[PDB]
């Protein structure tokens, strides 16, 4: 969906560190911690929450918005021609809301790659264009 | 407490917000030094009377609303003396300041993008399974300063995907953070001047991203407001009878 | 405003307790003899909560250190005084203690002796400091042996060892009984006080020496009111 | 928009709220320059791996909630690579950062006292009405990172008035005035090193003294969530097997 997986599929190989940021849509009023957490390649999803908290993680209150974008320290191509890295959201609290306030919220997830980003060996995939009449 | 004023007409204003205002392309409007003969009936450089503070008429969001979309200089093609020189002039040129604000609880829900696309066109349905090349009426690719909405938002009505829009000069509006966004757009164009009634430079795009909601008996409805102000306004041609 | 000399450690906890009382009969129609449990000689371990009050005195702090100065006043139980020579035992506490009147602990020379008349003014001996950590401790949430974790068959829960203060044995001088009916009253001062981590006061009923123990008879230290909006 | 991170784990967090930092006893935790031989198989002090920030499982506040607690170092006894140290190692030193945070709404109510308990010793019933000693489980005395809820909160469950539980190194949490509390520990004990898995030098309590409340439709349940590190761990022993 975002840009950058469109314009990886123009090339071969890739390498570099990326951005995930999410943006918490929900009432004002609404409270609540969520434990975002990345594993790296050849790992296996963490079991529960306890044992994803033993690695690289983040707890995100909503005292902050959504200034929590997680940082992918590096990702690579040396091979394609659990290899990958793998992000995961838990509820470290439930949701919490007064009366009148919804009882369900929407996050928004942008990404991109950061300046150590690079791609090398550069290769037309498509859709369609077209017929001719 | 503060009440920004620029002309004849004034606006109350919370500014600037969760990120400050967005200048597109990092690049203020600007006069043109450059263009293009030049000659001596060359552009005619007006405010502050025609680039003056115009508030639209004020769209309702709803649970179920899919977007709206305004094309520029198309909104103000008609509105008062900004409508007047575009109308009776053969060059056009011009920037905008383009402010958007939401009027919401603190009960209240949702995300907005805000966005500017250089030349939005717009491509209609074909047939809901087929090829039939029709092209949209100018009720929806100039729809004035009473905007349209979309239709499938998921391509922004012109098969290409919104989740990517912030390629695009954009800011987010989040009834959670802020209320308000702000964005600064320069003239842009393969030429220096172009027709004001027939090309539309670009268009404003405010799609829900994550849609309004409200427990029962909250205001059902959240009104935006869109504040807009020509910047660097130009106007070459001369005179003319529409 | 002037002086608060008498809020001080010392003030508080420094004065001569009634710590315990030994009981040596003649022999006879009588029970129990005893007492403490001597066929003719009293074992008595060190336990400062022999007075009533000091227990919870104590236990508003969670580490103590202190020396102890003990005096012994020796009658007959109706406080009549006789030529009898006593002997008192200090036995430290990696020391074995005497189990006859004929032990050899009696004349073990690193276990320092007493011998006094009743004739003579109680005596009166310091112990210094004798735990082998920094300080005492009431209060031990844990288990003491470094074993197997997982198996506590032994409800020893909350205690700590390293308290042990040692041993006073009683005795009559002698290889034949004394023809007089005694008893041996202990007296203990505790001298040098340093308390460390306060702790609210105990607020129910002791049930065990052991542990902060309590019955599900929960009671307030005080609720005289009828209702918060009168007062007599 | 403050991001407090010390480790692999980010912790978000608003500090410092409505009475700044307790240090217990005014006394900042210390490494060992003092005991104990000292030999040169003596402390292996590591940094800042073992000592991060550790989250345990968040508990539920409820209108008839009678309280929580925790035993230190038991809770994090199995808990990632501190768990490691304390369990293959022989002697053990620490102190901590404690930080306890409520998530509710400004329509939700009540007060907790969090405190820190040395040498916190359980007592359980000796039956209702009767004297039988018998002492807590395992479960009870060393609940491990899940706690452990208190029976009868008023006495502590150790005979022990909890209206004087201030005393101990401790900080309210009153969902009206504040949402948070954090509690400084220095290792405190007779000895300066001592067995992690048979030694619990305090105990943590977290009671509410004034009742939950809030009217009916908002959300019946209170987060409270534990976030604790170790600060100037010291490990001695050497090898072990389990």
Redesign the interface.
């Given at each position: 969906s975002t840009l950058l997986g469109q314009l990886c599929g123009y090339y071969t190989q890739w390498s570099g560190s990326l951005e995930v940021t999410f943006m918490f849509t929900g009432s004002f009023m609404a409270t609540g911690k969520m434990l975002i957490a990345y594993t790296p390649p050849g790992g296996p999803l963490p079991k529960d929450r306890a044992t994803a908290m033993l690695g690289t993680h983040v707890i995100w209150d909503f005292g902050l918005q959504s200034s929590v974008t997680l940082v992918i320290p590096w990702i690579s191509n040396t091979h394609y021609r659990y290899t990958t890295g793998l992000v995961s959201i838990w509820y470290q609290t439930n949701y919490v809301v007064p009366i009148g306030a919804p009882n369900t919220a929407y996050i928004i997830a942008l990404a991109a790659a950061q300046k150590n980003f690079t791609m090398q060996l550069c290769k037309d995939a498509s859709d369609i264009l077209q017929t001719g009449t | 407490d503060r009440v920004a004023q620029l002309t004849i007409g004034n606006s109350t204003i919370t500014t600037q917000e969760?990120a400050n205002i967005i200048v597109g392309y990092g690049e203020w409007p600007s006069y043109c030094s450059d263009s293009d003969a030049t000659a001596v009936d060359k552009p005619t450089r007006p405010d502050v009377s025609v680039n003056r503070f115009y508030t639209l008429d004020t769209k309702l969001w709803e649970k179920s609303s899919k977007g709206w979309y305004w094309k520029f200089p198309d909104v103000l093609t008609e509105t008062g003396v900004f409508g007047q020189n575009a109308q009776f002039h053969y060059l056009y040129r011009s920037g905008f300041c383009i402010h958007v604000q939401c009027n919401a609880s603190?009960?209240?829900?949702?995300?907005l993008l805000v966005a500017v696309l250089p030349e939005y066109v717009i491509g209609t349905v074909a047939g809901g399974t087929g090829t039939e090349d029709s092209h949209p009426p100018y009720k929806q690719t100039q729809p004035g300063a009473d905007g349209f909405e979309l239709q499938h938002p998921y391509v922004l009505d012109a098969g290409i995907?919104i989740?990517?829009l912030?390629?695009c000069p954009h800011q987010?509006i989040?009834?959670?953070?802020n209320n308000c966004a702000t964005i600064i757009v320069p003239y842009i164009n393969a030429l220096p001047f172009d027709s004001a009634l027939n090309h539309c430079n670009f268009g404003l795009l405010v799609v829900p991203?994550?849609?309004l909601?409200?427990?029962q008996?909250?205001t059902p409805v959240i009104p935006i407001t869109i504040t807009l102000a020509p910047m660097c306004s130009e106007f070459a041609g001369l005179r003319q009878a529409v | 405003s002037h002086s608060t000399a008498e809020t001080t450690l010392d003030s508080f906890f420094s004065r001569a307790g009634l710590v315990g009382e030994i009981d040596l009969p003649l022999e006879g129609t009588e029970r129990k003899r005893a007492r403490l449990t001597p066929n003719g000689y009293a074992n008595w371990d060190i336990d400062i909560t022999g007075y009533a009050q000091m227990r919870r005195k104590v236990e508003l702090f969670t580490y103590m250190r202190f020396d102890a100065e003990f005096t012994f006043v020796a009658c007959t139980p109706t406080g009549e005084v006789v030529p009898q020579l006593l002997q008192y035992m200090f036995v430290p506490p990696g020391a074995p203690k005497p189990d006859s009147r004929e032990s050899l602990a009696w004349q073990t020379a690193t276990n320092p002796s007493v011998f006094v008349k009743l004739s003579d003014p109680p005596a009166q001996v310091s112990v210094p400091f004798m735990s082998p950590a920094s300080a005492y401790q009431w209060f031990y949430d844990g288990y003491p042996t470094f074993g197997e974790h997982k198996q506590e068959k032994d409800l020893e829960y909350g205690a700590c060892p390293n308290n042990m203060m040692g041993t006073f044995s009683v005795r009559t001088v002698g290889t034949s009984k004394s023809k007089y009916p005694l008893v041996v009253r202990i007296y203990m001062r505790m001298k040098h006080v340093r308390a460390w981590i306060p702790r609210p006061m105990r607020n129910q009923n002791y049930l065990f020496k052991a542990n902060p123990n309590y019955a599900g008879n929960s009671i307030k230290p005080t609720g005289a009111s009828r209702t918060a909006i009168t007062t007599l």
């Open positions: - | 969760a603190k009960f209240h829900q949702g995300a995907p989740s990517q912030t390629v987010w989040n009834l959670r953070t991203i994550s849609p909601d409200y427990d008996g909250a | -």
